[model samples]
Target: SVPSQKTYQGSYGFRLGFLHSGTAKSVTCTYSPALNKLFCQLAKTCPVQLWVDSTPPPGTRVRAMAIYKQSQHMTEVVRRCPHHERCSDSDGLAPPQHLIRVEGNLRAEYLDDRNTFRHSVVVPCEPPEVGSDCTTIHYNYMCYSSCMGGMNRRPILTIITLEDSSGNLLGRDSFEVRVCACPGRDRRTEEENLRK
Candidate 1:
């Protein structure tokens, strides 16, 4: 995508709900000929639902769908979590999800405030084509596993998303690697430290 002169402003609303009642948080998202993309900085607080079905039940999969509806012209963002979930598993100590850490120390954590045990960083979706299904995403993260079950800990890759106040996709880039880990960081770190 290239830059242009004219600016675009779109009236967008975030609709989140279940089979029952839901919330339609109407907000303003910015876009434009100069910018070339939409912005979605949702001030809406975290809800009862999160993650890619953060904890989907067996047989039935539960999820919170984030819908973006433009007031005037009509537009919206998509959602997902196709990659590994960097979160806690359960009450017992099994292993961490696909967590990316800030520092090597277990006390260190990822810089994002959204990174919490019960909460999740809402991911935005986009349309691949103008008039196609909203099955596109602005930020797509990729992480490869060593598949070494024998190893206690390993390294991973994560491409975090960057957005603006209106939740618009500002750009894609990398960070200096903030330390964030799964639930039981020290427990796992002890084994890895020995390996070091």
Candidate 2:
């Protein structure tokens, strides 16, 4: 698991998830978008899930599907799954279902009479997507989520799902949300400045 942080306005978040099986004493999931290698570290056994949550809550949507890795080449794999339908299905295998859906609630509150307000959002898991993979012979599915709204934050997303080969729900790989804030900007025009 990774640490959590805050995201500034104008940023974007990317949601990621994966399924695992058997007992994994210790596991580490690492993804290189440049290399396109989504590998895992298994201390005792193979891990079940490894994912990311890059999106903010409220008014934002998160979605992901299983993408087949055609070639052993890392670069080719990452290039294939760039937010598209074909990236997920390569050799006529059925797409992985959404184990967890993207739905959140936003809350705003005023601390004092100064008219200052605070905003917050919470996202909860809906369900798990467990299925069979014919090509890999290791039943697995890839899940993803997307968000759209004001002041989007870029998130280093990750998800871990613990299930069996037969789509049976075991424990869970835990959940985390790390925020990366966007830089601030001023859009004031010359006319507006002159008025000020």
Candidate 3:
């Protein structure tokens, strides 16, 4: 579990939550847009609730959802940009531009081969005015395995993009999600390290 280093301030705001039994627990997130990182503290194989802050341009829809880098490659790419520099959208952290151009679902499914189930109705936008502060676009993301049983607990780089009715790019966000074995315990130790 990666605790948030700072509060998110970008136009595209995102939060993470977990589903346990029939109850829901909101997880704190750290949004470092400069590094193209949205770090969250969560255990592996849980249903994730993604709450995204909706931006302007009505009729906005989820254009694409994908996992850009994973496993060892993800670890190398994540080290490309430091915490201070702003990561370019074309950076290795996000999927290549050509891939985005040929837009569709890309038939991307996470943890599907491992028998993880995903809902058919993926991402649906809630009305903007529903929230007093801003719009909230919600979706369900399920990560069934942590580093796929590897010895290393590497974070996966996932990207989600949006487009307007006119086919204009609304916005895109990247997440550095580390679905681990002991989320709470890791968070506690990470916080301890932060204080040092």
Candidate 4:
């Protein structure tokens, strides 16, 4: 069972510290007693935080690359327009636009006086937010497999790397994030409400 509204934090190595959500206010998972599973609630843009424990040499550049993976069950359902009237061609063959990769660089402005690299990034959960976009592609949440978190979390793996001016690798680490909507809630029940 997945913990509800929990934030998992840890250090990838002596150099890199990682956490999900800028704060504990959002990017949380909830346990649904009705369904006996965990459902993570995610905003359109979930912010991730990364920091360096030790000061790095001058001219060190940090980069974060994220790859989003959806579960097989969610993929089958999300490819089709969830809302009945939202899409013109209600066919189930719509391309999966949500699975994507995003990268962010550590900016000079993000560095503090202590030389700690506190960088903020958003994971590629849904498509770029805009008018009428949500209707076309509904919000899809990553799901936890019937197994444990490690076995199949339908997670986002973010690789953080530090490089020097010569592009030499200084440090490297990875973090995992899982985003979900309803745990045991029936999609049909939710859609029925939307129809009204």
Separate clash counts for every candidate: 21, 33, 0, 2
Error of 2 at 118 (Å): 39
- What C-alpha lDDT values do all the predictions have? 0.24, 0.24, 0.36, 0.33
TM-scores for all candidates: the values are 0.19, 0.20, 0.41, 0.33
lDDT of 4 by residue, 1-196 (tens): 1111112222322233322222223435332223222234533333333344444566755444333334342222111113322334312322222221122321222211133212212222222236522211112232232223222444444445555666455566554443444422432343346567
Q: Please, what are the lDDT tens digits per residue for candidate 2 over residues 95-116?
A: 2222112221122111111231
Query: Candidate 3: which stretches are off by over 4 Å?
Result: 1-55, 63-124, 129-131, 144-152, 191-196
Query: Tens-digit lDDT track for model 3 on 12-68?
Result: 555433333311134433333333443343311223344556444556554323332
- By the TM-score metric, which is better: model 1 or model 3? 3
Q: What stretches of model 4 exceed 4 Å from their correct place? A: 1-14, 18-53, 67-154, 182-196
Between candidates 3 and 4, name the one with more favorable lDDT: 3
Which candidate gets the maximum lDDT versus the true structure? Answer: 3
Tens-place lDDT digits, model 1, residues 50-116: 1121222222211111111223311212211233333332213212332222211232222232432
Model 4 alpha-carbon miss at residue 155, Å? 3.7
Return the candidate ranking by TM-score, descending: 3, 4, 2, 1
* Displacement of the residue 30 alpha carbon in candidate 1, Å: 38
In angstroms, the error of model 4 at 45 is 5.3
